[PDB]
Amino acid sequence: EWQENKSWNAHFTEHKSQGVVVLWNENKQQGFTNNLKRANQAFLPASTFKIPNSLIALDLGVVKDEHQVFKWDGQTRDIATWNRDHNLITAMKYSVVPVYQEFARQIGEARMSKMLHAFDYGNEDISGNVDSFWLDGGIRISATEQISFLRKLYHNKLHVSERSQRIVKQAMLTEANGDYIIRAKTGYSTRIEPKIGWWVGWVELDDNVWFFAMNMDMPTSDGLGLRQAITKEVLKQEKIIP
Amino acid sequence: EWQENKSWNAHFTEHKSQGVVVLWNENKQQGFTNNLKRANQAFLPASTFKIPNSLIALDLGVVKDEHQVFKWDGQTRDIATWNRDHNLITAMKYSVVPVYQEFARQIGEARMSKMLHAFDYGNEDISGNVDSFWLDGGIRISATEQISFLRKLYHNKLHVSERSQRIVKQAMLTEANGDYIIRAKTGYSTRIEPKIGWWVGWVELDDNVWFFAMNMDMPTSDGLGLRQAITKEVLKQEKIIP
Numbered sequence A, B: 001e002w003q004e005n006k007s008w009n010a011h012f013t014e015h016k017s018q019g020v021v022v023l024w025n026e027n028k029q030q031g032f033t034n035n036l037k038r039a040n041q042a043f044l045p046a047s048t049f050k051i052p053n054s055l056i057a058l059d060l061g062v063v064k065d066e067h068q069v070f071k072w073d074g075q076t077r078d079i080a081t082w083n084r085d086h087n088l089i090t091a092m093k094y095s096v097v098p099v100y101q102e103f104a105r106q107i108g109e110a111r112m113s114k115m116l117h118a119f120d121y122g123n124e125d126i127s128g129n130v131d132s133f134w135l136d137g138g139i140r141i142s143a144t145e146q147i148s149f150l151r152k153l154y155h156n157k158l159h160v161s162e163r164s165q166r167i168v169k170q171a172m173l174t175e176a177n178g179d180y181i182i183r184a185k186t187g188y189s190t191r192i193e194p195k196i197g198w199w200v201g202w203v204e205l206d207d208n209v210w211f212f213a214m215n216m217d218m219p220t221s222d223g224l225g226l227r228q229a230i231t232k233e234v235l236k237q238e239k240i241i242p
């Protein structure tokens, strides 16, 4: 079952914005969205690709553990937080593209292609530069295919080791308190039209898990905070979080 | 209820191919597929677009009835059956692209877009050339979206006349005997990757209707007969046909 709930369109209208939110209730095995068509439209994943990229780099030994230091290469880039030493935890937190480009070059085309076929990930197409196909190449994924992928990660059912899956879930930690835990990854696709923002992940409660995937039109970086704000307005209306 | 049935994958691996078959049982309102992900992935419709294009041409009076002759323009093309006079029945049987390109020019961009919105047909996007957008422009549709559309046609529920719907169902007639009737349309998309074959339609029994939509990888035109043969192997396994 998928069920359409157009009342969530209010949360987008409030900000003169357009997009989709998809929720999956793990206990009841039912899905909900404001737009069934856009829920199945495939886009470039941009920084959401850092979840499968991390899994592959750990399983092949390109990354030894979550404390290994990746030293700054000395090139001043326009994002201040990229101009420093990182590990896996900080490289995911600050979406540090140059660290992930170096992992992809060491994984290589052949192993990257075989791993994405085993994950059943989006359209499985890596055409383009081995170190930029998720930003300006031929790979495409829908919000519903993001949920399918994330459910397998949650249950340790991807073909890679239990250990690789546990470390990446630790790196995805975004928020936690007495009411909920959020594990998630942001993305911003800016190189090829149409320009879109992503937020994909899940909410852990005492007795259930809600998986989510949202995308929205992002003509400039001024609206990037709306990825989390709009998603949290839907979770409150559904009584998932206070 | 959607159920995944991976035993059907044997009919694709037998012929060294890959694809999806989707079935819908009208009496039970239940669907079956070998591949839930591919069942909801969007592709160019190619010649399966002759179903909506026929419906719109009839309803606007571009085509008067099933007997009206469309005289060959006297340009020699590749397919020998295209180099002769046609009516609606023979144009759909032989998939005569040049006849349908002239229908699209007389319908025009504004009326074509309005009718695809009224039908809820795929992504409803006609961007590209008015006479080739279903071959190489922006329009996309999934196997499950082809079923939704065909169910409305079967029940005379699309927003055109009853007369337009009855004449198109006549032009779709493919096979009939004492056990079953098949109404359907073939497609073959090669202008954009991946290259795919389509077969969409339904099977009329004495007391039920089974809707189907299949697509499969088609690297050369040598495998085109597999569109029908693999679909009939699934129908036989499920005891829908003898």
Ligand SMILES: CCCCOC(=O)[C@@H](NC(=O)c1c(-c2ccccc2)noc1C)[C@@H]1[NH2+][C@@H](C(=O)O)C(C)(C)S1
Pocket: A046, A047, A048, A095, A096, A097, A098, A135, A186, A187, A188, A189, A190, A191, A221
């Ligand atoms: C190795 C250098 C790679 C840069 O790779 C990009 O394509 C990045 N994009 C941009 O720097 C932007 C932005 C913009 C502006 C303000 C704040 C954020 C982004 N506007 O246009 C371009 C071009 C990175 N791509 C994103 C992603 O991978 O999701 C990002 C948020 C990490 S930012």
Ligand SMILES: Cc1onc(-c2ccccc2)c1C(=O)N[C@H](C(=O)O)[C@@H]1N[C@@H](C(=O)O)C(C)(C)S1
Pocket: A079, A080, A081, A082, A092, A093, A094, A095, A186
């Ligand atoms: C979480 C998170 O937690 N803290 C910050 C933060 C705090 C202060 C400064 C910068 C970031 C942060 C965040 O925003 N991280 C961003 C993110 O991945 O969503 C990335 N980094 C941005 C950038 O460095 O500007 C970017 C536009 C490259 S995408």
